[PDB]
Chain A
């Protein structure tokens, strides 16, 4: 199998800027049989380029492909708001047909540190027998962030899940939630609940915490 490596995983660019996406094959691609696709969240992929450089019907010529052998490039000469999406390469020069891992092209903006909010379990949930503690990181950029839970200064592991929104269309920020889940009985056995947030926009990690019963 020919392995296709796409670099980088994420491009951060402003509208009107030039975009260059890399697709590299573990073996030479016969007859430059290399295709590029665009995919937006919740939609099927869409063919942009085939034969390394031929543009599919109706695709704007600001998308161009080049390269041969093992090194191929998708260039977006001037980024439009609708071009920020995930892009995939695919070779059909040898069987089996294989895809690259994809590159996300996102909007660059100024660094924004998250506003951290922590939510203790509601009294109605505690009556249902479970306790969810929610830590909210709101309107930050860039996307990379780290959240760690501490219960009475004990570092948690394997009992929290994270969820991240798509990049906001107005301010180009992300938001993230981390949810620590445990039973009502276990919740009552501990006092301090804390989430520690690490992010480029913070001088040092920020801890938000509460004492059970506040």
Chain B
């Protein structure tokens, strides 16, 4: 507690591990989060630590056996209230209702972008939004997938995220005019959406692995991509691309 070895942990935490083992053979652990203590069988960071908040809530920190995953759970005096799982790569993921079911969930990516679900029901539906660098996409959640939607005029851009995180993008236009109706094709291999108007390609939208969006225009004849892809930094730039 001063006879101890310090171990760095995911989630900006540190745990102190005894060198000598306690009265009953196990190593004791001290990690300040409110100070939590516990006893484990290894002399690394792994183990379980308990504690009690000043408001009578009980805290349970579970450090993974390979030191790459902390699980911070907060209970009432018994019933889950919180469950933050932070990882070594800075990635982290909840609030519960009275029935012990998931009520909210925030997925923080390693790069800082977030995916927030609010008002989750028993069937699995709720309100969803993704926080990117510079703008926020909003949509819904279902037990099937996450759909984020951007509207401009009669055009609707839909970004779909499957359960495993696979991104696919759709576009629909309720415009009746063959001269102005936007259609699009999705190339999942290159993760690129090519928009077409009046049987000419107009622009490519690329949804990168860095959770960003780039736009590149074709020439007036729809023949060649021109210039270089420009990164989108504002929500109005997405709507402009959809005009």
* Residues of A bordering B, CB below 8 Å: 30-31, 33, 92
Contacts and interface: CB of A to CB of B under 8 A. Distances in A.
B179 interface: yes
Q: Which of B197, B198, B220 has the most CB of A within 10 A?
A: B220
Interface residues of B, number: 4
Interface string B79-100: 0000000000000000000000
Interface of B: 179, 197-198, 220
Cβ-closest 6 pairs across A and B = A92-B220, A33-B220, A31-B198, A31-B179, A30-B198, A31-B197
Nearest to A93: B220
Contacts of A92: 220
A91 B179 CA distance: 17
Contacts of B197: 31
A30 B221 CA distance: 11
B218 to A, nearest CB: 13
A46 to B, nearest CB: 19
Contacts of A33: 220
Nearest to A35: B220
B175 to A, nearest CB: 14
A147 to B, nearest CB: 47
Nearest to A95: B221
A33 B222 CA distance: 13
Contacts of B179: 31
A31 B198 CA distance: 9
6 contacts: A30-B198, A31-B179, A31-B197, A31-B198, A33-B220, A92-B220
A143 B124 CA distance: 80
Nearest to A92: B220
A165 B197 CA distance: 49
